[PDB]
Amino acid sequence: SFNSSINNIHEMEIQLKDALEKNQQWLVYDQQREVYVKGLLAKIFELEKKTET
Amino acid sequence: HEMEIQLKDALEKNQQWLVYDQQREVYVKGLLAKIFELEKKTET
């Protein structure tokens, strides 16, 4: 019937709003990784300094 | 259909994040391995 065709358009809309805000989730996620990563680099810099003395 | 198109672009970028993410995780693990080695050093 035509139920399948209507459902698919809902389903396709579902996917796009799910995909769009998934990439938006990626942005936030990655921003936090950068914070963690610059912290690790600061920690390495102090450990290298400590292993030199 | 225009919504059909941007669904594909959304999924494209979504794939680009995915591969980028794999690279970044390897990088994070590398820094942690380096820290581990450094902390092991001194110590002694």
Partner: peptide, 13 residues
Amino acid sequence: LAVGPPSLNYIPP
């Protein structure tokens, strides 16, 4: 399907 990050907040390995 679309894939999102393993969490909403970054969790280190």
